[PDB]
Structures are given as C-alpha cells and as structure tokens.
Design a protein around this ligand. Structure first.
Ligand SMILES: CCCCCCCC(=O)OC[C@H](COP(=O)(O)O[C@@H]1[C@H](O)[C@H](O)[C@@H](OP(=O)(O)O)[C@H](OP(=O)(O)O)[C@H]1O)OC(=O)CCCCCCC
Ligand SMILES: CCCCCCCCCP(=O)(C(C)C)C(C)C
Ligand SMILES: [Ca+2]
Lengths: 436, 82, 255, 119, 10, 96
C-alpha cells in the first residue's frame, strides 16, 4: 500500500487503493486512511467493491461499506442476484440441498429450493434471498451482517434455524452438518434473547409481531416456524406462554380463580351478577363468557363424559334386533365427532396425521364405522355378536382418548408425557418379554 | 430405564405441547359440540411497518447490549495506559 | 407550503419574537431545553447522537439543524422518525429557499439542494449562508426568555453542538460564543479545538486535521480562522470538549 | 379399569336388563383381576376371527397395566429426589408452636385446666 | 385562521 | 493425557479432511506393534476415542456400504422384500 500510494499516478486513484486493501483484507488501515471526509462516497462507485467483498468472504469490509452510505436494497438487483446464485454457489452445497429436498422434504425447504431454482435458471425480498445464500454456505459473520439489515429479524432467525437443522440432518458430510447445527443453535439463541427483550420492553406490540405474517418470507409466522422446528426453548419463554394463556382464557380475566369459573359454568345465572370479574353491557358479558375457549373446552369435556355414559347405557343395557332411539342419538353424536375430525384433517393433512393423538383419534373412527355397519345386519346372529364386540373395543379406545384433557393442567400435564414415553419403552421391553 | 427416562425435565416439553391444544380451539369455531352441527351447517354455505420499526429499534438496543460485553475486558484499561 | 409536517417561507428580515409567538401559541409548548447542531458514520458518532436525541426526547428539548437530506442531519431525522414510531420530539430545519433545488407554491406536495422530510418543521429564508443570523437571533431571544418551571435558574438553557468542520462551523461557533449565554460542545475542526484546549499551535492543529481545507483556503481566510479560534478559546470556561452516559454528563457539565 | 370392565361385560353377554346383576358383574372384574384367581381366565375359555382380537386386546390391557405400574415408580423417583431436610425444618415450626402456645399440661389432666381457662 | 396569521407574520 | 492428545488430533484431522483420515485410521504401519489405530483403541477399551463422530461416520459408511448413507430405512426394507423394485427407483445409490 505504501509503495502504490507513492507512484505519482495512484495518489488520485483511491479506488485502486481500496481494491488492494480489500484483496489483502486490511480493515483498520482502510478505515483510517482512505475512508475520510475528504471526498464523497457514492453507492455506484462502491457497488463493484461491495460485490467483490461479498464474493471473497469479507464480512468486516461489508459492514464498513454498509455503514458508509451504501444502500443494500438498491444494490441487490435481479441480474446480480441470479449471477451470484448461479456462478458462486458451490456445486457441493447444491448437491447437499438436492439430497435434503429428495429425502428430508419440508414445507419450508421446498420454498427455498424453488427460489434457488428460479434465481439459478434465470425479487420481492432480495435481503431474504441474500441471507439464505449466506446461510446455505455456512457463512457466519456475513449472515449476521445481512441479518442486522433484515426487517423480520426474529422471523428470519427462526427460518434460518429450521433450514440449518433440516440441512444438518443430511449425512453426506459430517463437518458441514455439524457447522450448520451449531449455527442454527446460535441463531435460535439470538432469536430467543431478542424476543425476550422485545416482550420485556412492551407486551402488545410483541404479540402483534409474533402473530404477524410477513410478505411471504416462507409463508409462515414466527410461531409456526418455531413449532415446526420443535424449538421448545423459544416457545417455552414466559412471554409466549402468557400470550397462549391470554388466548386460552380469552376475554375472561386471566387472574380470576378457577373454582369461580367452574361455579359460573354449572350455574348460568350467577355468571352475569358477580364474581366473574371480566378483564374488559350485560349481554356483552354473557356472550363474551360463552365465547371463551376455556368455557368451551370445559363444556366439551362435560358433553363427552355424557356421551360416553350414554354409549355405555345403550351398548350395555338397551340393545335389540330393531333400532332404538338412544342408538340413533348416539349415531348422530358420533357423526358430529366425525365431522369435527374431518374438519381437523382438512388443514395440514400430512402434518395433522403426523400428530400422535391424531393417529389414535383417526384410527377410532374407522373401527366405529365398521362396527356400526356390521350391527345393522340383524338377520345374522353372528354379525350382531361381532358388532357388539367391536362396539366394546370402540368404548375402550374412546375411554383411552378421554385422558387427553389433563394436558390443560399445569400440575398434571407432564405426567401424561411421561406415560407416553413409558409406553414407547415398555412396548419393546414387553416385546422381549413375549419373545423369551 | 423408567427412572432414567423420567429423570429429565418435562416442564419444557409440556409448554411446547400446550401450543397445539391452544391452537386447536383458537382456530376452530368457538361453539360446543352439542350445538356445533348447526354451526357447521352455516359453515358449509402497510400496517406491518409500524411494528417492524419498533422491532428494528429493539434489535439495535439488543445489539448495543450484546456489544457492551466487550467493555468488561481490560482492553480499555490497556488503551488508557497506552 | 406544508410538505407531505410543517414548512414555512420566512424572509431574512423577520422578527424573532413573531416566530417564537407563532411556534408557541398554537404549535408547540415551552421548551425545557434546546440544542443546535457525505459524512463519516463511525460507531462513536452513530451512538453519541442517538444518546443526544434520547436525552432530548426525555427532556422534551428542541433540536435545530440545517434540514437537508444530505449529511448527518438525514441520520438525525431518520432516528427521530424511528423513535417517534417506537411526548413528541421537535426538530426544526433551517435553510435558504433559493438554495432549494425545487420550489413549490401553495397544501403543496414535495417528492424527491434536497431537503429531508423526516424533520417535523422546516423554514426557508428568502434572501436571493443566509440563515445563520436568524438562527443566532432566535437562540439569543430564547435565552432571553424566562421559564420559572425550568430547573435552570431563570432563562431556558441552550447548547451548541459541533461535530464537523468547515468555515460554516467556525462561523457559527464564533457567533454563538459572541453571545455569553450559549455554550458549545465539541465531539477535523473538532479535533483541532480538542487539541488546542499562540498562532503556531493553532496553525499546526488546523493543518493536521484538515489537510485539504487549509490548502484551499487563502492566507487571509486562515488568519480569520485563527482569530475566530482564539476568540472561542478565550472563553474556554463555556466551551467543553468530549474525550475520545457521556453525552448527558458533558451537557450537564457545560450547563 | 372401568373401560375394560364394561368391555368385559359386553364380551361376556350381549345384553342385561337388571340394575343389580350388571353392577355386581362389573364390580367383580377389578377384584377378580387383582386377587389373582380372576374368573377372566374361565371367561376366556366365527370364533376363529373373534378370539384372536380379544386375546390381543387382553395383552394390550396387561401391557398398559405394566406401563402404569412402572410410571408410578418413575414419578416417585423424581419426587423423592429433591431434598427434604429443608421442608421438614419449616414444618417443625408448626409442631413446636402448637405446644409452645398451648397450655403445658397433658390431656389426662387438661380438662380440669381447661375449666380454669373458662373462668 | 392559520393562513391569515401566516400572512400577517410576513 | 496421551489418549486425549490422540483424540483431539484425530478430531482435527477428520475435520480438515475425511477420506485421508479414514485411510490413515485403517492404514497399517510398518509394524509399530502389528496393529492399526482402531485395533489398539478397541484393545485398550478407549471408548472415548472410538465414539467420536468421525469414527462413527466411518463405521456407518462401512456398514451401509455402497448404499447411500442418507436414504430412508423403510425404502431399503421394501427393496429387500421386493426384489424388482430395487433397480427401478428409490434405492438412490451413493455411487450400470
Ligand atoms: C369432571 C370430569 C373430570 C375432570 C378432570 C379434568 C382435570 C382438568 O382438565 O384440569 C383441571 C384444571 C386444573 O387447574 P390448574 O391448577 O392446572 O391450572 C393452572 C394453574 O391455575 C396455575 O396456577 C397457572 O399457572 P401458575 O402455576 O400459577 O404459574 C396455569 O395458568 P398460567 O398462569 O400458567 O397461564 C393454569 O393452567 O382445572 C380446571 O378447572 C380445568 C377445567 C376442567 C373441566 C371440568 C368440567 C366439569
Ligand atoms: C368416532 C368419532 C371419534 C372422535 C374421536 C375424537 C376425540 C376427541 C374428543 P375431545 O377432543 C372433545 C373436546 C371434542 C376430548 C379431549 C375431550
Ligand atoms: Ca385432533
């Protein structure tokens, strides 16, 4: 640099000095010597230098350029982005992405794959595309620098964590997968801390941001990405739990005692004339009470208990070759349950079936309908016998289902999860037992 | 083996699982089953910038907080000595 | 015309009392505090002014600037807008109407010298720098105002802020210091004043800080600059320099 | 247990229309299973289709029982793991106070003292 | 109102 | 101490490159003790060394063989039971 500065022709050519410093990665020298108020710094003049710094993995120079009056939004043209995705995108990483897409497909990885294909063969959120490009190549500092400029910072962090986790589950190369996994954990921690601070500063705005859906970063919000990535740490934070509790109680006051709500539920008239203590006219109070999710869930469990009792009554004490009214009523009730189940299946069918309890409840319906079909045939005695036995099995499975309610209770919820894990292990243990 | 499995905490997994339970009712129509079928029959037949600016401000505050940790090092004392 | 906060075109021969009455009667309240201020956006300069604007918001202080989209004032306006997005801050830009690249008569609309739209209020001088005298007169008059509610004994406090160089900065500093009440704070020229706090030292510091500005300036201009700097330093008990919660500390110490 | 009992009631006989035999038959299954000589063994003995499913679900009931029996100990271990040398010290205060504030007389002679308390 | 006041000011 | 040194050195060696590390690990010297690194590690019951991610990856590659490491297991099971399906689809070999 000293030799080139004193050449009688390079003194005026500051661009050459900047190019050489970028090539040799001299940050402090460039900041102190060339970056000064002597001359203005236009974005167009610095565009080529910024591109070169991006190519050659120069994060600190990128940060310096961004600080010194560089508009990154205007720089990321479509032609530049497609050229960068096509030429400087390593073929090894593209092969790894193909492997992940073919084997470990996801609702998100398909989106980034389509975006990459579009930019490679030939946008709304250039910053998001650049951040994805930096992430896929496990560039840490550059990814952080690009993230600092993004709008959906926490959403971008969650998406990057999910993408890195699904990329690391591949096994073509261990080192890259481990690097991606550690980077994903780092970004998850960053998002958790940032949202914790965000909720501490304010409450309503944090909830609005959390529930807010962007201009199709990945077609999902922060909560959906967090749950899809199984980011238990992020969604277990006090702010998110408070938001969930507010949604669960609804218009009802969060701090009112539970037994008061139970008494109001059983006793309708007491609701509008006392201890309900709503958070927010009399008809408004009543409608708000009856629209609360918690009251709905309590009434639904009551109705389900009544349904099971009626099921026992009609499957045990009242049965004949000819139909009886309780049986027809039970048919309507089970049809209502089936309609609700199919409504559930209508949304995210694959992911809905991925759920554990979903498997059990979905399985129950087929057995019930088979038994109901078999019962109708009264001419054959054996068919009636088999149908009644199948109804008994149906009762067993429904009573097994009834246990799901305890999840709502703070003091009782973990026990059910422990039971599920114990089932998973004891299955194999008793398998060996039965073998020997 | 059960002892080893139950040893690990579940106060975090239960919180994660609670989200599905909350969503199941939040997204669904808020009507009990004994009267849901009727409702089911009727079923058959810009602003972002305001929150995003505050998000950016909080991000800047968080970056300041995370960067301030470097001040705890003796580098500042060494610079004063220099 | 109302740019789309408020934008007015007041001639140079205007009464400061009239402007204060217009701004106080139906636009703004009494001011507990008032501060007046391509560029190097170093982290130190990026944080000092953020702290300054936060302090102004906390105290409800007026901020006076040139009001152009090119320079640090654009950064100040952007920070003001961001904080407002996050008890309102008051920012007034002052410039020459003729100096504006485009002029529209009106509620007219201005769409992109170029003036920033972030600043809430803007004033244009009809002379043909021609607004320095008006700003100095307004600052002196405000310092002449009495506000019992203000903690500052009697008069409303006023602080001058210096971050960059140029003949305009030295002229403004000299004009402000000529008034006893105003006090100055120093963040090229800033380094010169920091180093100085007779002719040899000032000349050496000026040459070191601004290699090109001194070269371009004639000898008479350099002598005038030295005279201004000597006059400013003679009243060093008012002027304060920041060492390269510090902004609030420095402002409080100066006051 | 009630679920499996009603299932057993259904398997045994199709229907029953008396509010006495049904309740006794249902209540018999728990004690029968627990005390070891459950009539269920006698009860077990197109049949080719019905029998295997019943046997499989009986095995399911047994494995569920084992699952609960082990999960109980699993949770007890987690609960007993935490220290109690602090909680017991806290509880000791109530025991000490109960006697300290009360009159220091044994019950066989407290009533007489109680009389003097009344006046 | 405002227009008249502004005109009177200048 | 020497076991820790070897573990760290081979971890770095595998991080820098993969194929060469495996060749060195399986390589037999000019009769240092008539055995390779893996044989000595197993003989010494050096559970820490042979449990490292690089060694486990090498063992997994040996176990799966020419089959792709990342293909789903149920696909392999179906291909096993159904011979014709192997050559005309989802096998997805790593390497006529
Ligand atoms: C009746 C048949 C059998 C019913 C058995 C079914 C039993 C069942 O389903 O849950 C019982 C539940 C227990 O209440 P539970 O103490 O666990 O509720 C938690 C408790 O209030 C905590 O205090 C809260 O947090 P924290 O610890 O203070 O920090 C937490 O909310 P949050 O503060 O964290 O946001 C609360 O969730 O009480 C009911 O009434 C629910 C409606 C039951 C419907 C009953 C309808 C008759
Ligand atoms: C043949 C239809 C069987 C439907 C199985 C679905 C069971 C769900 C019952 P629930 O979800 C109630 C709130 C609807 C239970 C948790 C109280
Ligand atoms: Ca469900």
């Amino acid at each position: 640099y000293k030799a080139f500065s004193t050449n009688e022709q390079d003194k005026d050519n500051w661009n050459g000095q900047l190019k050489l410093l970028l090539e040799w990665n001299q940050l402090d020298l460039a900041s102190d010597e060339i970056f000064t108020n002597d001359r203005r710094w236009e974005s167009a003049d610095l565009q080529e230098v910024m591109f070169t710094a991006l190519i050659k993995d120069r994060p600190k120079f990128v940060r310096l350029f961004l600080e010194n009056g560089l508009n990154l939004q205007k720089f990321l043209t479509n032609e530049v982005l497609t050229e960068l995705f096509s030429t400087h995108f390593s073929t090894l990483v593209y092969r790894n992405l193909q492997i992940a897409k073919n084997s470990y497909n996801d609702a998100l990885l398909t989106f980034v794959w389509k975006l990459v294909a579009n930019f490679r063969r030939s946008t709304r959120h250039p910053l998001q595309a650049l951040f994805i490009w930096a992430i896929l190549q496990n560039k840490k500092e550059l990814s952080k620098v690009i993230w600092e400029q993004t709008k959906g910072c926490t959403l971008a962090a969650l998406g990057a964590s999910k993408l890195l986790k699904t990329l690391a589950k591949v096994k073509n190369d261990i080192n890259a997968a481990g690097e991606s996994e550690e980077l994903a954990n780092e970004y998850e921690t960053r998002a958790v801390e940032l949202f914790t601070e965000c909720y501490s500063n304010d409450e309503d705005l944090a909830e609005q941001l959390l529930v807010y859906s962007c201009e199709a970063w990945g077609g999902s919000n922060c909560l959906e990405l967090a749950v899809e990535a199984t980011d238990q740490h992020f969604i277990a934070q006090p702010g998110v739990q408070n938001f969930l509790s507010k949604q669960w109680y609804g218009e009802i006051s969060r701090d009112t005692k539970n037994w008061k709500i139970i008494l109001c539920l059983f006793i309708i008239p007491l609701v509008g004339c006392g201890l309900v203590s709503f958070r927010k006219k009399l008809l408004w109070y009543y409608v708000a009470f009856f629209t609360s999710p918690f009251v709905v869930f309590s009434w639904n469990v009551v109705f389900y208990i009544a349904f099971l009792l009626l099921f026992a009554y009609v499957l045990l004490m009242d049965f004949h070759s000819v139909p009886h009214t309780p049986e027809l009523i039970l048919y309507a009730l089970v049809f209502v349950l089936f309609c609700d189940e199919v409504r559930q299946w209508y949304m995210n069918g694959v992911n809905y079936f991925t759920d554990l309890w979903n498997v059990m409840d979905t399985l129950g319906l087929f057995y019930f309908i088979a038994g109901i079909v078999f019962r109708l045939h009264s001419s054959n005695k054996s068919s009636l016998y088999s149908g009644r036995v199948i109804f008994c099995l149906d009762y067993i499975i429904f009573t097994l289902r009834l246990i799901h309610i305890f999840t709502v209770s703070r003091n009782l919820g973990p026990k059910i999860i422990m039971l599920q894990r114990m089932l998973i292990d004891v299955f194999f243990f008793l398998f060996l037992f039965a073998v020997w | 083996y059960t002892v080893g499995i139950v040893q690990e905490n579940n106060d975090q997994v239960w919180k994660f699982q609670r989200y599905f339970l909350v969503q199941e009712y939040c997204n669904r129509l808020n009507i009990p089953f004994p009267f849901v079928v009727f409702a089911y029959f009727y079923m058959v037949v810009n602003e972002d910038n305001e929150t995003l600016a505050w998000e950016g401000v909080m991000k800047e505050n968080y970056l300041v907080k995370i960067n301030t940790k470097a001040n705890d090092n003796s580098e500042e004392m060494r610079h004063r000595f220099r | 015309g109302d740019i789309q906060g408020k934008y007015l075109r007041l001639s140079c021969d205007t009464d400061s009392e009239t402007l204060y009455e217009l701004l106080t009667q139906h636009w703004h309240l009494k001011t507990p505090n008032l501060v007046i201020s391509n560029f190097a956006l170093k982290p130190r300069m990026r944080k000092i002014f953020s702290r300054l604007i936060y302090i102004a918001q906390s105290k409800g202080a007026w901020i006076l600037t040139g009001g152009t989209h090119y320079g640090l004032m654009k950064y100040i306006g952007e920070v003001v807008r961001d904080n407002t997005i996050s008890e309102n801050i008051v920012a007034i830009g002052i410039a020459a109407w003729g100096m504006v690249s485009n002029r529209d008569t009106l509620s007219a609309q201005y769409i992109m010298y170029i003036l920033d739209n972030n600043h809430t209020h803007l004033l244009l001088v009809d002379n043909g720098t021609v607004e320095a005298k008006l700003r100095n007169q307004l600052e002196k008059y405000i310092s002449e105002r009495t506000s019992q509610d203000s903690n500052y004994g009697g008069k409303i406090p006023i602080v001058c802020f210096a971050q960059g160089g140029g003949r305009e900065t030295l002229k403004a500093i000299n004009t402000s210091v000529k008034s006893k009440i105003p006090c100055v704070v120093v963040e090229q020229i800033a380094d010169v004043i920091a180093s100085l706090v007779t002719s040899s030292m000032v000349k050496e510091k000026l040459v070191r800080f601004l290699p090109r500005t001194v070269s371009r300036l004639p000898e008479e201009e350099i002598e005038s600059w030295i005279k201004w700097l000597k006059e400013i330093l003679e009243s060093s008990h008012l002027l304060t320099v920041i060492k390269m919660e510090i902004v609030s500390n420095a402002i409080s110490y100066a006051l | 247990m009630v679920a499996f009992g009603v299932a057993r009631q259904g398997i045994l006989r199709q229907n029953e229309q008396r509010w006495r035999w049904i309740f006794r038959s249902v209540i018999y299954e728990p004690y029968l299973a627990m005390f070891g000589q459950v009539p269920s063994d006698v009860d077990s003995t197109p049949e080719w289709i019905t029998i295997p499913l019943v046997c499989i679900y009986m095995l399911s009931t047994n494995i569920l029982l084992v699952n609960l029996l082990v999960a109980m100990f699993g949770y007890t271990v987690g609960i007993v793991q935490e220290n109690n040398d602090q909680v017991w010290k806290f509880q000791r205060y109530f025991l000490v106070q109960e006697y300290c504030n009360r009159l220091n007389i044994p019950f066989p002679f407290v009533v007489f003292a109680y009389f003097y308390m009344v006046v | 109102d405002l227009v008249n006041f502004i005109q009177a000011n200048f």
